[PDB]
Design a protein around this ligand. Structure first.
Ligand SMILES: [Ca+2]
Lengths: 223, 34
């Protein structure tokens, strides 16, 4: 997260870290046994880390649970980044509490202008590299479909939306992939892509979660 | 070690990639091996 702020320990209790030794992606807990992330975050042997703040120091609220299943959307297109969503099943149900909690799936899509909360342990600089210990947060509005398509002509599918700032300086960044975009209590987005980080006229592009509710439900029900 | 282009951990050891470098992807919001 570039140009964001320190969330505060466990203030985003649905935020998880995808780990294979070290953090490599974000994700969102949507119930006690399932995590939503980006399809391009797929790899074998994922460990899910819940209740995390400082990802380098055991602070006592963590849970470390291996993924038993990592299910990429079967229509994921690595060329267009369409359907960039993945579902991870936990080997065991996480213990839900005030610091480890699920985020609701949306019942309807969000509108342009709606302010959302984006979070992650990704890069905090738009040029260079700087990895935070603790979770960083960013308030960002959803942009109009027109301004999104103007930013990325011919590259935005109906399953994507832009959020952030056309002036740059504030954005999600590398290391944030798979993480949450939460709007009015609903998981509406998944950190996916963009052109660099916090660059002018290149806001973040996010997987539009509201278009995947049925696939998510079916997948959970059948796994 | 991981091939070029494969997902890697930004704050991990550079030896996680055969190339010895884990770098930002230009488009995806992950790090990948150089
Ligand atoms: Ca920790």
């Amino acid at each position: 997260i570039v140009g964001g702020y320190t969330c505060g320990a466990n203030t985003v209790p649905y935020q998880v870290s995808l780990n294979s030794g070290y953090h490599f992606c974000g994700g969102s807990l949507i119930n006690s046994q399932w995590v939503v992330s980006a399809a391009h975050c797929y790899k074998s042997g994922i460990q899910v880390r819940l209740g995390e703040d400082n990802i380098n120091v055991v602070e006592g609220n963590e849970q470390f649970i291996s993924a038993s299943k990592s299910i990429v959307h079967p229509s994921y297109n690595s060329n267009t980044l369409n359907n960039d969503i993945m579902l991870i099943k936990l080997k065991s149900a996480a213990s839900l509490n005030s610091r480890v909690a699920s985020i609701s799936l949306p019942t309807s899509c969000a509108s342009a202008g709606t302010q959302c909360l984006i979070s992650g342990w990704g890069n905090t600089k738009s040029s260079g590299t700087s990895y935070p210990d603790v979770l960083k947060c960013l308030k960002a509005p959803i942009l109009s479909d027109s301004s999104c398509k103007s930013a990325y002509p011919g590259q935005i599918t109906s399953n994507m939306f832009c959020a952030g700032y056309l002036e740059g300086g504030k954005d999600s960044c590398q290391g944030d992939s798979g993480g949450p975009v939460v709007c009015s209590g609903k998981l509406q987005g998944i950190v996916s892509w963009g052109s660099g980080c916090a660059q002018k006229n290149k806001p973040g592009v996010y997987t539009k979660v509201c278009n995947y509710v049925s696939w998510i439900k079916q997948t959970i029900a059948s796994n | 070690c991981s091939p070029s282009g494969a997902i890697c951990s930004g704050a991990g050891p550079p030896e996680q990639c055969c190339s010895g470098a884990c770098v930002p992807h230009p488009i995806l919001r992950i790090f990948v091996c150089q």
